Design a protein around this ligand. Structure first.
Ligand SMILES: Nc1ncnc2c1ncn2[C@@H]1O[C@H](COP(=O)(O)OP(=O)(O)OP(=O)(O)O)[C@@H](O)[C@H]1O
Length: 260
């Protein structure tokens, strides 16, 4: 149902480098309809079945999900060169998009990106799916008003991880919230990395002493308080995505009214 014939795909520009291979933009075309822009994840060592299985695992996972703010799987070509065909988010990785548009993107748009990701994550939470790596690097940009979660198949990211994940390797719905807190901070920091210039081991000890990422310049205090809740040391004290979504919706409306 998801297998694609590769003569229906034409590779275009290399739009990024992935863990397994280059990612290319391109087009999927079937006789009647668009003109579907697509991303094509390639896998250079795919002939090794060990890497192929780990490569296609992303597509298998993405397949379970159907949400406006989660990257859609379009198909796979499972003959090597093994390719994963997915929805093209033309504007690319969120981080870079934020760094480049540092002084052209309103606060309203930043919170909207936070909000849109809280809807994707509420949805994943509803399916009891634990993502494990919520980070700006894992968000793709569809339009200036649309952001999408993209990272399945995964990986060390100590500065994004909940204490219990670093320490005990425990990955839960509550740890995803911790990471979403950090992702929100990254967005408000215009794609700046957390704890930059601090050793991973120093972050660990700081966190345990009550220390947290500072309030971003121009961050609403209401939004920083929300981030602070995501970073409760005790995972059980962390909010869930239903509450984060509702509160981001409310923070968003008030920023829109803050200039009218
Ligand atoms: N669906 C897409 N639309 C647009 N650009 C993409 C898409 N997927 C990947 N890219 C680009 O290619 C780069 C590699 O993305 P990729 O998801 O392979 O990162 P990875 O760490 O290798 O994999 P994962 O995020 O699944 O762990 C991204 O940073 C982005 O620049």
């Amino acid at each position: 149902d998801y297998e694609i014939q590769r003569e229906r795909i034409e590779l275009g520009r290399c739009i990024g480098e992935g863990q397994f291979g280059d990612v290319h933009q391109g087009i999927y075309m079937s006789p009647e309809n668009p003109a579907l822009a697509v991303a094509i994840k390639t896998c250079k060592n795919c002939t090794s079945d060990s890497v192929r299985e780990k490569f296609l695992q992303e597509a298998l996972t993405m397949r379970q999900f159907d949400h406006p703010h989660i990257v859609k799987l379009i198909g796979v070509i499972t003959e090597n060169p093994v390719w994963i065909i997915m929805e093209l988010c033309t504007l690319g990785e969120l981080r870079s998009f934020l760094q480049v548009r540092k002084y052209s993107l309103d606060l309203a748009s930043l919170i909207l990106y936070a909000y849109q990701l809280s809807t994707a994550l509420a949805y994943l939470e509803s399916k009891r799916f634990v993502h494990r790596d919520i980070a700006a690097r894992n968000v793709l940009v569809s339009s200036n008003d649309c952001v999408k979660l993209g990272d399945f198949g995964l990986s060390l990211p100590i500065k994004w991880m909940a204490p219990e994940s670093i320490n005990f390797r425990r990955f839960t719905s509550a740890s995803d919230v911790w990471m979403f807190g950090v992702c929100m901070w990254e967005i408000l920091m215009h794609g700046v990395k957390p704890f930059q210039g601090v050793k991973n081991n120093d972050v660990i000890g700081r966190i345990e002493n009550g220390e947290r990422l500072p309030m971003p310049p121009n961050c609403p205090p209401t939004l920083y308080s929300l981030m602070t809740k995501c970073w409760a040391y005790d995972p059980s004290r962390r909010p869930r995505f239903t509450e984060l979504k509702a509160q981001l919706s409310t923070i968003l409306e008030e920023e829109k009214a803050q200039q009218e």
